[PDB]
Ligand binder design. Structure first.
Ligand code: FUK
Ligand code: FUK
Ligand code: ZN
Ligand code: ZN
Lengths: 106, 103
């Protein structure tokens, strides 16, 4: 249940962009499948459910406003694919953003 | 806010002092030590053995005697910046490899 924060991926079968792209197939949900594959995610085949090949972290119910890489950071901040690809400079923006997002509206 | 804080500012700054966090436990006779939990940034909710990190907001429960506060902090809230400040990524990584080698 806990997410992988090691530097080795949990599903190395899904480590190649093409392997991940194939899992979606015809994809009808609001959020783009190339965008999701680039962000590490492959598809389960149960609705819009996706999983990061590295952290194992899963997400669902994608709104059009929700960005793969942004959601990757929100829920799986320990991911090492995330850190390798966007780098803690970016990752900290999201979190301040996402915390500050909540203080305004309340 | 279900998602955990990975900013460098704590979520509950009222619980940022050790003496604050420890005062929440009171008489505590769950299996795992309350000073150990407070040092690891946890304070008590008062609903069983439920605790919360003052920084990440990350919550845990049902403490086995085998389960260590700092180890569980890393397992479930690896993005915590109190965790990173206090143990460093050197520690944090071995403890992940140790969990991920079990799983
Ligand atoms: C794109 C966003 C993602 N949000 C978060 C989300 O999807 N999370 C959060 C979290 C990490 C607690 C979580 N754990 C499990 C699932 C589960 O379904 C799943 C299991 C295995 C998989 F391989 C894929 C998915 C999902 C999931 C959405 C908000 N979420 C959802 C509606 C789930 O319920 C909580 C609520 C706050 C909005 N859209
Ligand atoms: C000491 C360990 C902790 N484990 C993990 C655990 O406590 N987690 C995992 C996680 C992060 C998904 C999670 N999210 C919510 C709670 C919730 O209760 C809570 C909310 C707010 C609080 F302020 C305090 C607690 C807890 C919790 C235990 C294993 N856990 C538990 C039994 C919870 O259910 C899942 C299962 C795998 C073993 N003991
Ligand atoms: Zn990941
Ligand atoms: Zn924490």
């Amino acid at each position: 249940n806990f997410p992988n924060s090691t530097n080795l991926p949990r599903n190395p079968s899904m480590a190649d962009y093409e392997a991940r792209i194939f899992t979606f197939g015809t994809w009808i949900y609001s959020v783009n499948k190339e965008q999701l594959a680039r962000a590490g995610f492959y598809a389960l085949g149960e609705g819009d459910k996706v999983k990061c090949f590295h952290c194992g972290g899963g997400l669902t119910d994608w709104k059009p406003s929700e960005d793969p890489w942004e959601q990757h950071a929100k829920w799986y901040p320990g991911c090492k694919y995330l850190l390798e690809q966007k780098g803690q400079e970016y990752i900290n923006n999201i979190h301040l953003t996402h915390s500050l997002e909540e203080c305004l509206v309340r």
